Design an enzyme around this catalytic site. Sequence first.
Site, PDB file in Angstrom:
ATOM      1  N   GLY A   1      -4.247   4.070   3.038  1.00 55.24           N
ATOM      2  CA  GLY A   1      -4.125   5.418   3.557  1.00 55.24           C
ATOM      3  C   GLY A   1      -4.526   5.598   5.006  1.00 55.24           C
TER       4      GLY A   1
ATOM      5  N   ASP B   1       4.719   1.629   6.349  1.00 54.95           N
ATOM      6  CA  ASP B   1       3.835   0.561   6.817  1.00 54.95           C
ATOM      7  C   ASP B   1       3.751  -0.579   5.805  1.00 54.95           C
ATOM      8  OD1 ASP B   1       2.373  -0.102   9.134  1.00 54.95           O
ATOM      9  OD2 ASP B   1       0.482   0.122   8.044  1.00 54.95           O
TER      10      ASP B   1
ATOM     11  N   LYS C   1       7.058  -0.039  10.530  1.00 48.63           N
ATOM     12  CA  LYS C   1       6.442  -1.319  10.856  1.00 48.63           C
ATOM     13  C   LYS C   1       7.442  -2.459  10.678  1.00 48.63           C
ATOM     14  CE  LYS C   1       3.297  -4.516   8.866  1.00 48.63           C
ATOM     15  NZ  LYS C   1       4.679  -5.018   8.651  1.00 48.63           N
TER      16      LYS C   1
END
EC number: 2.1.1.-
Length: 394
Positions: A124, A207, A244
């Site tokens: 997170g 991500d 990412k």
Amino acid sequence: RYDWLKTVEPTNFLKIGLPYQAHPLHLQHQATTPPSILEKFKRADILLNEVKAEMDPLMLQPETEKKLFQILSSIDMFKGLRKKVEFTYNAQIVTNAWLKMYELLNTMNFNNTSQAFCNCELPGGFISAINHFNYTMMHYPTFNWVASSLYPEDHYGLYQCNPDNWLMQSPLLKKYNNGDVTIASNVKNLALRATQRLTPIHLYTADGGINVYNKQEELNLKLHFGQALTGLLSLSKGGNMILKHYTLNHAFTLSLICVFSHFFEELYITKPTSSRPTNSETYIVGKNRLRLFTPKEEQVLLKRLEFFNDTPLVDLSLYQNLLESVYFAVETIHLKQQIEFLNFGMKCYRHFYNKIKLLNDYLAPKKKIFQDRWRVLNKLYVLEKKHKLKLCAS
């Protein structure tokens, strides 16, 4: 002399802009002859893997394996910054994801960060950094957000305490979205859930990354393709995007940025300074979404993910301008900066594999200079208690 140690400079935020594409997007149905520039991208892959392979001899024995990882820890200039940021400013879940997201927000000048969809997110870091940024920097009256992740890992209880916000499901509900974004039905459902539970969506982040060093981009193609598809299925017009990535050398990766180039006013390959210069991590950032998918575009891409293969999504020869700018990104981030920092680490290993406190003594002052610079460049203010996220673990 150890003057090379004495002369180390901080790195910079590296940001390479990409040209938006005027012409209509044509999603490819047939394999096409590759543009000559792909041979350049393949040269970059071989060489970057050559420098990466240089650490292969040290990995064979566990003894030298440990010294190698001590050395790599010793030359990380940001090691103390997470704990510092956490205590000084009441920042939560200050993992490296936190720093990277916070640096991205302070640099990229987003028009809005107020309706966040954070996918592949646990533990997170990204939501926490955005929550901190939105309350101390932007002062949005209230900040609504949704999130999803492949089910476990929740280290801070951010998932268990906020069931309103999470779009993944537990194995108990195996009937069902486990949050695996390599599954086409999961992607369309994830986007459907996010848009129902929160709209507009002004900021999408993803991500994700598998790991185990020569096929890392190849092994992550499907994960990232779905990462992309989820965002581009949910992000409102005018919204922003952060994905990412790694080495950007595969023709499918290049074809994927080609799709991106049709949907945002601006597009930038980035490497923030809080991202370790020794690894290949990159961040593709799109600002200000110009338009949504057409119904055909939805169908074609989701089928692409459903029966996946590494044929380019588009005709790469129609993006000569964009491919050159991507190559300038790889050259700056990967062939120049990363290769230099790998060579620096091996050199540090050769002269200090047995002198670890010594190498740390030399770099101690430089680490304080670097971490102070980061804090000066990305201004932080204390997060009031009433705006902390509700966590379920310590």
